[PDB]
Amino acid sequence: SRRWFHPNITGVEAENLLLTRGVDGSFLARPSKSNPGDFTLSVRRNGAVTHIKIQNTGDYYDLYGGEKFATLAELVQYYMEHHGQLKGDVIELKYPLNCADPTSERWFHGHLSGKEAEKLLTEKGKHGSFLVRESQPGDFVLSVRTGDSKVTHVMIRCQELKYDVGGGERFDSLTDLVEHYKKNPMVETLGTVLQLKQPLNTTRINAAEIESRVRELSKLQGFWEEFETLQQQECKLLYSRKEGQRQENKNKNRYKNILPFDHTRVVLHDGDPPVSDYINANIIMPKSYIATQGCLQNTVNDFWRMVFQENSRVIVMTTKEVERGKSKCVKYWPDEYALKEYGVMRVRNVKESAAHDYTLRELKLSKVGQGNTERTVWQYHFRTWPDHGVPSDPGGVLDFLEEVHHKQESIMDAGPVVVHCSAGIGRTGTFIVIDILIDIIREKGVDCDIDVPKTIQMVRSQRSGMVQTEAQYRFIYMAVQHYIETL
């Protein structure tokens, strides 16, 4: 349930909603109208409404007078289970004020004719594939596919702000109606059970026709709607992050609330003979990756223990050490030609090679007191990503990725590619998803199916909030487009 997020409301609409339909402790979140890319958390307290700014430049959600989070749902879950934390006065998030607007649902298709929706369910649908469109006069149509085959249309009437299928219950939202008939399916007179198994997949595109999709997603934007429908699916990804919350592990996190999932975290087995198994890092399985945060002075040894145990031969750094006067990642590698020890691990910097968009460092890693453990580790340091937003052209990112890929393909039995930035979720997620998408187009060529949100969602179940902003989302499409056009 992420119903507390209203995508199409102004600050004034939000104020009236919380005053007339809410109580003290009532809250909602919404996208900013005065500055796109920002969010507002509106809370009712002592009869008055407080508007709290949330910012996302692409690394994390930064709440004003609060903490840094991987997702809006992780933010809201934290403040609803940690009172007295949001402020002089304490602001309590007690009651989420639900949104009835169906615009961010995977099944809602707004304007769509009966023939067009039937063409979509006939060409793309399967058993249980459904969608909801606007009639065809203020009413709605639920269109479902059944078989292994036919298409049924269930009329949905909007009467006095309530929704119904002809008889029975009247629902406050189309969502409450859809969720009801998902659990208890409508049975036709002659035995057909109208199972609402999955929403109709319309995001899956053929690689060769990316330029067509990008053109449409750019029309009044379509990119904003597809991304917001993906954000609404983040409430299904609140997996436990217990290990990261342990007292002994707290100072091993760059941002106390951006934690690895327990089910995919990297477990370190080197073990200095109390709590030596932790790193803020996750395994990302589509060639594998490891997504991690930028080192802290106290986590550099753990970082090399990870690289060594995982047999990784390639590291992708997507940040400068220092950005906007803030430490983003500590320097975990020696100076060129220098040799250094990071606990039981030894690193030599053999050669540094500068290119326009990046530096390549040839590092040799080994365990101290064991010469035959030596292996070359290639460090790809991308240096030209802007402090805010994304590069305006994907060429540089694409050339860099093409080079990282060839290095990784040339090494036999290379472990996962290590990818990091600051919190290890924004730029990191962006690099991994482009890399996953372009890998499909490598083996299967131009005549293959690519599904950007399905890929992001799959990467997000392995690490919280991978791909942070709408701009990164649009950058993923632009990069895939450029790759297919330069083939």
The least distance separating ligand JE4 from the CB of residue 196, rounded to whole angstroms, comes to 14
The residue behind tokens 């550099």 is: 300
Q: How many CB atoms lie within 10 A of CB 203?
A: 17
425 assigned ligand-binding residue = yes
Q: Nearest Cα to 30, choosing from 51, 54, 5, 57?
A: 5
Residue 163 or 382: the one with the smaller Cβ distance to ligand JE4 is: 163
How far apart are the two ends of the chain, measured CA to CA in Å? Answer: 43
Residue 51 or 454: the one with the smaller Cβ distance to ligand JE4 is: 454
The least distance separating ligand JE4 from the CB of residue 460, rounded to whole angstroms, comes to 9
Selecting among 235, 295, 421, 448, the annotated active-site residue is: 421
Distances, alpha carbon 270 to alpha carbons 171, 245, 307, in Å:
57, 21, 12
Residue 380 or 475: the one with the smaller Cβ distance to ligand JE4 is: 475
CA-CA-CA-CA torsion sign (474, 476, 482, 487): negative
91 assigned ligand-binding residue = no
The least distance separating ligand JE4 from the CB of residue 226, rounded to whole angstroms, comes to 4
Tokens of 370: 């064991």
Distances, alpha carbon 313 to alpha carbons 130, 167, 308, 345, 363, in Å:
45, 63, 9, 15, 9
208 assigned ligand-binding residue = no
Residue 44 or 213: the one with the smaller Cβ distance to ligand JE4 is: 213
422 assigned ligand-binding residue = yes
Report DSSP state, residue 168: S
The residue behind tokens 């991304």 is: 227
Kind plus residue range of the DSSP H or E element containing 42: strand 38-45
Report DSSP state, residue 193: B
The least distance separating ligand JE4 from the CB of residue 465, rounded to whole angstroms, comes to 14
Residue 49 or 467: the one with the smaller Cβ distance to ligand JE4 is: 467
The least distance separating ligand JE4 from the CB of residue 131, rounded to whole angstroms, comes to 8
Query: What residues contact residue 5 under an 8 Å CB cut-off, 6+ apart?
Result: 28, 29, 30, 72, 99, 104, 231, 232
Q: How many CB atoms lie within 10 A of CB 123?
A: 7
| 329 is a catalytic site residue | no
The least distance separating ligand JE4 from the CB of residue 222, rounded to whole angstroms, comes to 7
The least distance separating ligand JE4 from the CB of residue 468, rounded to whole angstroms, comes to 15
Residue 435 or 470: the one with the smaller Cβ distance to ligand JE4 is: 470
Task: Specify whether the CB–CB gap between 223 and 470 falls below 8 A.
Answer: yes
**Residue by residue, what is the 3-state secondary structure of 260-277?**
CCCCCECCCCCCCCCCCC
Query: What residues contact residue 302 under an 8 Å CB cut-off, 6+ apart?
Result: 252, 268, 278, 279
Tokens of 23: 């109580």
Q: Interface with ligand JE4 by CB under 6 A: which residues? A: 106, 108-110, 199, 201-203, 225-226, 229-230, 233, 453-454, 457
Tokens of 389: 């937003």
Q: Nearest Cα to 396, choosing from 470, 287, 318, 469?
A: 318
423 assigned ligand-binding residue = yes
- Please name the amino acid found at residue 53: K
How far is the C-alpha of 283 from the C-alpha of 303, rounded, in Å? 14
Residue 252 or 454: the one with the smaller Cβ distance to ligand JE4 is: 454
427 assigned ligand-binding residue = yes
Query: What residues contact residue 310 under an 8 Å CB cut-off, 6+ apart?
Result: 266, 290, 415, 416, 418
List binding-site positions for substrate: 387, 421-427, 468
List binding-site positions: 387, 421-427, 468
Residues labelled as active-site residues: 421
